[PDB]
Design a protein around this ligand. Structure first.
Ligand SMILES: NC(=O)C1=CN([C@@H]2O[C@H](COP(=O)(O)OP(=O)(O)OC[C@H]3O[C@@H](n4cnc5c(N)ncnc54)[C@H](OP(=O)(O)O)[C@@H]3O)[C@@H](O)[C@H]2O)C=CC1
Ligand SMILES: NC(=O)C1=CN([C@@H]2O[C@H](COP(=O)(O)OP(=O)(O)OC[C@H]3O[C@@H](n4cnc5c(N)ncnc54)[C@H](OP(=O)(O)O)[C@@H]3O)[C@@H](O)[C@H]2O)C=CC1
Ligand SMILES: NC(=O)C1=CN([C@@H]2O[C@H](COP(=O)(O)OP(=O)(O)OC[C@H]3O[C@@H](n4cnc5c(N)ncnc54)[C@H](OP(=O)(O)O)[C@@H]3O)[C@@H](O)[C@H]2O)C=CC1
Ligand SMILES: NC(=O)C1=CN([C@@H]2O[C@H](COP(=O)(O)OP(=O)(O)OC[C@H]3O[C@@H](n4cnc5c(N)ncnc54)[C@H](OP(=O)(O)O)[C@@H]3O)[C@@H](O)[C@H]2O)C=CC1
Ligand SMILES: C[C@]12C=CC(=O)C=C1CC[C@@H]1[C@@H]2C(=O)C[C@@]2(C)[C@H]1CC[C@]2(O)/C(O)=C/O
Ligand SMILES: C[C@]12C=CC(=O)C=C1CC[C@@H]1[C@@H]2C(=O)C[C@@]2(C)[C@H]1CC[C@]2(O)/C(O)=C/O
Ligand SMILES: C[C@]12C=CC(=O)C=C1CC[C@@H]1[C@@H]2C(=O)C[C@@]2(C)[C@H]1CC[C@]2(O)/C(O)=C/O
Ligand SMILES: C[C@]12C=CC(=O)C=C1CC[C@@H]1[C@@H]2C(=O)C[C@@]2(C)[C@H]1CC[C@]2(O)/C(O)=C/O
Lengths: 327, 327, 327, 327
C-alpha cells in the first residue's frame, strides 16, 4: 500500500519517500566521483529529493551537489533541491535567521549550487535573536523573489512552527510547509506525537533525518569504533562519545535484539530501521546518508521490507526499544 | 445585434467572439506552413485570440505558434495569447498545479512561445493534490512577475472556481477571470446553467472549446470514420470509440435532422453549430479547431448565420437534441 | 503669497505651479527645434512639470520630449514627467484601462520617452469596459514595478475617483493622487466645486489643462479663424466649430470685456486668464500650451499678474463671465 | 557584562556597540588614505557598522566609503552599511521623503557606494510635506526591491515614529526598526526617556550620534578654538558659535569637573563620555567620529572604561552635569 511518491505535508510538492542528504559526505568525507555515483543511483531509482545546507563542509557540499546536477544535465523541473540556512560564516552577521542573513545566505548558497532557486529553503535551527515576524517576512521575500518555491523549519518546537504560522496569517505572509526533524528508533516523540498535530492543524509536513542515528542503527559499533566509520572522522568526537556513552552501549544491546527480527524478515538492520521510519504516512520523506554505493543500495532496499512490517512486528520492536511515546 | 469583440467575463480584456486553438493540429497533424496560413486567415479576419497548452504535441504547438507570431511580426499588443498548464513532463514534479510546476511550466511555455508573457494562463484541469491556496498564490505570483496578464481555470466545477475566488478574497490574491469549458450541442449543462451564475456572482467569463465536438458535429462521421479525419489519427482511438459507440450513432441521427435546418437556413452544419454556440451573450468566445483553410473559412462563416437563429429555430434544435438543460 | 512650488494634492511630489504640455505641438504642429527651445525656456524658468500622452501625434510627442531630455542632459531627479494612457493603437486590445493595455501602453510610452519611469501615469479618460479593481490593481502593479512613481485620473467624475479610492483601501492597493481636469474661465464647476472635496477627503490633487481653452481665451479669434491658429489645423475642425458656434461667439463677447480688465492691470488677456487659474490653492499646477516662444514667455508672465487679482477684480470677472458655480 | 555585539532594537541585525560614521571627514576633512586607515582600524577591532548619508560632502563620503570596501575586499555579509536620505540635490524634487526622492536618492547613493543595497536606509529627518503613508510605503518598496534590508528614522519625535508604525500596521507595510538620535552628556532626554518606550512598545532600536558633541566633549575647546579643529572648518561656523556661546562656556566648565573623574578612573575624557553613552542597554550602538587614528584608537578604548562606571560614578557625573532627565 506504499506510495513511493507523496505530497510534502499539505502542499502540491511531490517528493520520493526517500531522499539523499549531503551532510558529512559531499565535499567532505567522500570524493566528488563517489558523490556523483551516489546521486546517479538515487535519481535512477526514483529519488527526486536532495538535501544540503550552507554550513556543510563550509559550502563545498552545495558546490559538489550543483556540479553533479550540471554535469548529469537532469531537468531542473524533475528535481526537488532543498538547502538549510543559519551558519554562513564567522562574522557576527553571517549567522542566524535575520532578514540580512536569510537573503545573503540563500543568495550565496544558490551561487554555489549554480541554481536559480531551491525548491525548499529551511531555517537550519531556531534563532532566539530574531523576531518570528522578521524571519517569516524574509522567507516570504525570497520565495516572492523566485529564490525558493517553499520554506520550512528544522529543529523547531511545534509551538515555534505554529508561531511562524500565526505570523503568516496575521500579516498575510507565506506559511512554512515542512519541518525537517530527527527520526529513528531512538528519537521518536516529536515525529510520532507532535508533528502529526501540525499536519492536521496547519498542513506542515515532516521530512526526517538521520534514520540510522548517524550509522549507529546499522549496528557496526557493536564492538567499538570501526576504522573510518563516521564516528572516527575528525570533528565527530561528539558522535564517538555518544556511542561509547552508557546509553550508547544500551542502544547497541537493543540493536542486537532488533538484528534478530531483521534476519527473521530477510533484511538487514539498516533496511529494517529505514522501513520502520516510513511505516506511518505521517512522514513524507526520510533523508538518507551514505558514504559508499553498497550502503545506498542497501538502504534503498528498505522499501521492500515495508510490506513485512506487520502490527505484530511493530509491537515486537516497541517491546525491545521500550520507548514508545505516549499519545 | 452581434458584437464581434466582447469582454472576457467581467475583465477589461477584449476578445474576438471566435478564437483559434492549436490542439492536435499545430506541431502535430498539420504542417507549420498550414499552421501559418490558418493563423494568418484568423488574424486577418479579426480574430485576436489564440489558445495553446504546454501539453499539446509535447510543447511543439507552442513553438509553432510562437514562430508564426515572430515571422508575421504582428504587434504583441494586438494579440491575446493563452496557454494551459498541468501536463509538463514525465517526472513526478512536472505535472499538476503546485507552485513549482505552475512557475516552471509557464516559464518553459513562454520560452517555447518566444514570448515574455501570455495574456491568460489557465490551469488545464483541477489538481486534487494541491491545496487551492497554493495554486491561487502561484497564479498570482506569475501575474505579478509579468508572465501573464490574467489567469483562469479549465474543466473546474463551479464550486472549485468559487473556492479559488474565496481564497483570493481571503488572502488578497488575484481572482480567476475565465473558465475554458467544453460547449457544443451535445454538452450544454455547465455552460448554459452553471457558468452564467459565476458570471453574475464573481465575473468569471466563459471561453468554450470543441464547438464541433472534435469534428463530430460536422456530420462527416455519418457513415463511418473518414480517412485522415481526427478520429482516425494515432492516439485518438478514444474519439473513434465515442463515434462508434451506441450514443455516438444516436448523435449522428440527430445531426441528420439538424442538417435539414442548416439547408433551410442556407448554411452548413458546422456553421449552424458554431453560430449556435455564440447565440447567448454568456459565452465570451468560442475556440475553433481546423486542419485546413476550407474548414476555417467555413467556420468563420458561422457569424453570418447568427442573425438567422430565431427563437423558433432554437426551439426546433432543442426539440431535435432533446437535451435542453433545466434551469 | 504665491508659492511657485507646491505639493501635488496631498503627496510629497513638488511641482511648479506651471507645467508645459505637449498636446498638438510636440512631434506635430511645431518642429523638434522649437520644442527644444520651449522646454529649455520652461526648465530655465523653474518649471519641472512636463505632460504628454501615448496618443499625442501617435507617439511622436513622447519621442520628441524624450529626445530633448536626453540631449539637454538634465538630471532625471529634477524633472516631473507625466504621461497618459488609453489610446495606444488601432487594435481592439490597444485601447482602454485593462491590465493588458495599462502595462503594454506604459511600457511602450517609456520606450519612446527613453525613460525608465514617469513620475505620474494617468488614465487619459474613464473606461466603462474595465472594472475599477482591475485598473487600480494594474496601476499599482506598474508603480510597484518601478515604471511610475504615482498614478492619477483624467476626466473622471468625482464619484469615479472615489471609487478608485474605495478599491485601493478595500484591497490594500495604491490610491490615485491627482486628477488632470479642464480648467479655464469657461469651464469652472468641476475644479472649483468638486475637486476641492476630493482634496480634503482623500488628498487628490488637481492638475488642470487648456487654461486658454485651446487658445480661445487669448482672444485672437475675435474676428474669425486666424491663419495657422490651432483651430485652423488639420484634425481640429471640432475646435473651429466651437469657435464659430453661437456660444463660441458669446464667449468672444465676454473676452472683449475681460480684455478691458487686462489693460487696466497692465497684462495681456492670456496672462490674466492663466493667473486667474492659479488664484486658488485648490489647483496644484496649470499645464501650459504654446506653439512659439513669444506665447510661452507671455504665459509664464502670468505669475506677475497674480498679486493684482484682488477680490474686487475676481468679482468683476465673475460678473462678466456670469458662470460662477454654486457651492 | 558588556556584550560587544547586540541586536539593533528588536530586529535580528547584530551590530557592534561602536560604529564609525563618515560625516565631515570622509570625502571632506580627511584624505581617502586616512579614511581607509580609520575604517581598517575599526573593522579590525570588531566594528561592523558604518554610517553615511547622500548629503555628506555632496555624495563624496559615500564614494570614499564604497571605494574602501571594494579595495579592502571585505565580505559584504560581514558589514552593516547604513545611509540616510533627505538632501539629495538643489532641485525642488531632489529633497524630502517623497516616494520619488526616496527611490531616486537611495538608487543614487547605492551607485556611489558601489553597493547593491544598504543594511539600513534612514530618513535623515522628518518631512512635513510628505504624508507618512507615502514615506512608509516607499521605504517598504525599496526594501522589497532589495535595495535595503531595513529602514529607520532620524531626528523624528517618538510620536512620528509611532505614526510610521501605525501606518505600517494599518496597511500591512514594513515598520521602522531604528531611530538615529543625538546622544551625549549634554543631550539626554530623548534617548534616556523617550526611546526606551519605543523599544518596549514597538521594538525600535536606538543608534546614537555625536557622542562627543562634535568634539566639544573632548575638552579641547577649553581655551578657544584649536587650529584645524572641526569648529574651525569652513561651513562649521555654527559649531564655533555654540562653543563660544554662553552655554558653550558653561559646558566647558562642567567638562573640567568631569576631567577630574576621568583621571580618577585612568581614562581620557572622550573615553569617559563614550563609555557613558554605552552604559545603558537602551543604546544599541554609538556612532563614532574621528579625523585621525589617535582619536579613533583612543575612542575605541572607551570599552575598557565601561566596567568602571559604577552607580556611584554615574551619580557623580549627574551631579556635575545637573541635567538628569525626569522619568
Ligand atoms: N535538519 C538537520 O538538522 C539535519 C539534516 N540531516 C539531513 O539528513 C541526511 C541524512 O542524515 P545522516 O545522519 O547522514 O543519516 P543516517 O543516520 O542514515 O547515517 C548515514 C551514515 O551512516 C552510515 N551508513 C549508511 N548506510 C549504512 C549501511 N547500510 N550500513 C552501515 N553504515 C551505513 C554512513 O556513515 P559511515 O560509512 O561514515 O559510517 C552514512 O554516512 C543528511 O545528509 C542531511 O541532508 C541530518 C542531520 C540533521
Ligand atoms: N481546455 C481544454 O481542456 C480544451 C481546450 N480546447 C481548445 O479548443 C480548441 C478547439 O477545439 P477542437 O476540438 O479542435 O474543435 P472542434 O470541436 O471544432 O473540432 C475541430 C476539428 O474538427 C474538424 N473540423 C473543423 N471544422 C470542420 C468543418 N468545417 N468540416 C469538417 N470538419 C471540420 C477538424 O478535424 P479533422 O479535419 O482532423 O477531422 C478540426 O481539427 C483547441 O484547439 C484548444 O485550443 C479543446 C479541447 C479541450
Ligand atoms: N488630460 C487631458 O485630457 C488633457 C490634457 N491637456 C494637457 O494640457 C496641456 C495644455 O493644454 P492646451 O490646450 O494646449 O492649452 P491652452 O488652452 O493654454 O492652449 C494653448 C494653445 O493656445 C495658443 N496660445 C498659447 N499661448 C498663447 C498666447 N499667449 N497668445 C495666443 N495664443 C496662445 C497656442 O495655439 P496656436 O498658436 O496654434 O493657436 C497653444 O498651442 C497639453 O499640452 C496637455 O499636456 C490638454 C487637454 C486635455
Ligand atoms: N542622523 C544624524 O542626523 C546624524 C548622524 N551622525 C553620525 O554620527 C557619526 C559621529 O558623529 P560626530 O559628530 O562626528 O561625532 P563626535 O561627536 O564623537 O565628534 C567626532 C569629532 O570630534 C573630534 N574627536 C573625536 N575623537 C576625539 C578625541 N579622542 N580627542 C579629540 N577630538 C576628538 C574629531 O573632530 P576634529 O578632530 O576635527 O576636532 C571628530 O571628527 C557621524 O559621522 C554620522 O555617521 C552625526 C550627526 C548627526
Ligand atoms: C556544527 C554546527 C555548526 C556551527 C556551530 O556553531 C554549531 C554547530 C553545532 C550543531 C550543528 C551545526 C551544523 O553544522 C549543522 C548541524 C550538523 C548541527 C546539528 C544538526 C545540523 O543542523 C545538520 O544539519 C546536520 O545535517
Ligand atoms: C492526454 C492527456 C494528457 C496526459 C494525460 O496523462 C492524460 C490525458 C488525458 C486527458 C487530456 C490530456 C491532454 O493532453 C489535454 C487534454 C487533451 C486532455 C483532455 C482535454 C485537454 O485538456 C485539452 O486541453 C485539449 O485541448
Ligand atoms: C482624438 C481622441 C483620440 C481617439 C479617439 O478615438 C477619440 C478621441 C477623442 C477625444 C480625444 C482623444 C485624444 O487624442 C486625447 C484627447 C485629445 C481627447 C480629448 C482630450 C484628450 O484627452 C487630451 O489629452 C488632449 O491633451
Ligand atoms: C546642512 C544641512 C543640509 C542642507 C540643509 O539645507 C540644511 C542643513 C541643516 C541641517 C543639517 C543638514 C545636513 O547636511 C545633515 C545634517 C548635518 C543636518 C544636521 C544633522 C545631519 O542630519 C547629519 O546627518 C550629520 O551627520
Amino acid at each position: 500500500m506504499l506510495q513511493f511518491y507523496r505530497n510534502l505535508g499539505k502542499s502540491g510538492l511531490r517528493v520520493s519517500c526517500l531522499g539523499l542528504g549531503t551532510w558529512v559526505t559531499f565535499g567532505g568525507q567522500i570524493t566528488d566521483e563517489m558523490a556523483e555515483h551516489l546521486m546517479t543511483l538515487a535519481y535512477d531509482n526514483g529519488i527526486n529529493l536532495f538535501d544540503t545546507a550552507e554550513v556543510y563542509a563550509a559550502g563545498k557540499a552545495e558546490v559538489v551537489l550543483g556540479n553533479i546536477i550540471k554535469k548529469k544535465g537532469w531537468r531542473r523541473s524533475s528535481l526537488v533541491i532543498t538547502t538549510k540556512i543559519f551558519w554562513g560564516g564567522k562574522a557576527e552577521t553571517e549567522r542566524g535567521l535575520s532578514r540580512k542573513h536569510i537573503i545573503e545566505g540563500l543568495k550565496a548558497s544558490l551561487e554555489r549550487l549554480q541554481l536559480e532557486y531551491v525548491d525548499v529553503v529551511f531555517a537550519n535551527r531556531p534563532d532566539p535573536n530574531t523576531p518570528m515576524e522578521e524571519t517569516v517576512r524574509a522567507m516570504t521575500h525570497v520565495i516572492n523573489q523566485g529564490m525558493a518555491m517553499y520554506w520550512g523549519t528544522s529543529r523547531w518546537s511545534s509551538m515555534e512552527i505554529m508561531e511562524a504560522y500565526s505570523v503568516a496569517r496575521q500579516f498575510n505572509l507565506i506559511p512554512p510547509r515542512c519541518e525537517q526533524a530527527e527520526y529513528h528508533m531512538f528519537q521518536r516523540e516529536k515525529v510520532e506525537v507532535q508533528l502529526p498535530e501540525l499536519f492536521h492543524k496547519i498542513g506542515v509536513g515532516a521530512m526526517t533525518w538521520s534514520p540510522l542515528a548517524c550509522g549507529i542503527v546499522s549496528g557496526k559499533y557493536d564492538s567499538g569504533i570501526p576504522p573510518y566509520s563516521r564516528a572516527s572522522l575528525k570533528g565527530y568526537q561528539w558522535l564517538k562519545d555518544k556511542i561509547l556513552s552508557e546509553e550508547g552501549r544500551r542502544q547497541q544491546a537493543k540493536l542486537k535484539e532488533l538484528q534478530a527480527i531483521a534476519e527473521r524478515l530477510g533484511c538487514t538492520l539498516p533496511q529494517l530501521a529505514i522501513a520502520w521510519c516510513l511505516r506511518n504516512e505521517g512522514v513524507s520523506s526520510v533523508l538518507l546518508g551514505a558514504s559508499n554505493a553498497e550502503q545506498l543500495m542497501e538502504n534503498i532496499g528498505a522499501i521492500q521490507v515495508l510490506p513485512k512490517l506487520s502490527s505484530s512486528i511493530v509491537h515486537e520492536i516497541d517491546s525491545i526499544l521500550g520507548n514508545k511515546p505516549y499519545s
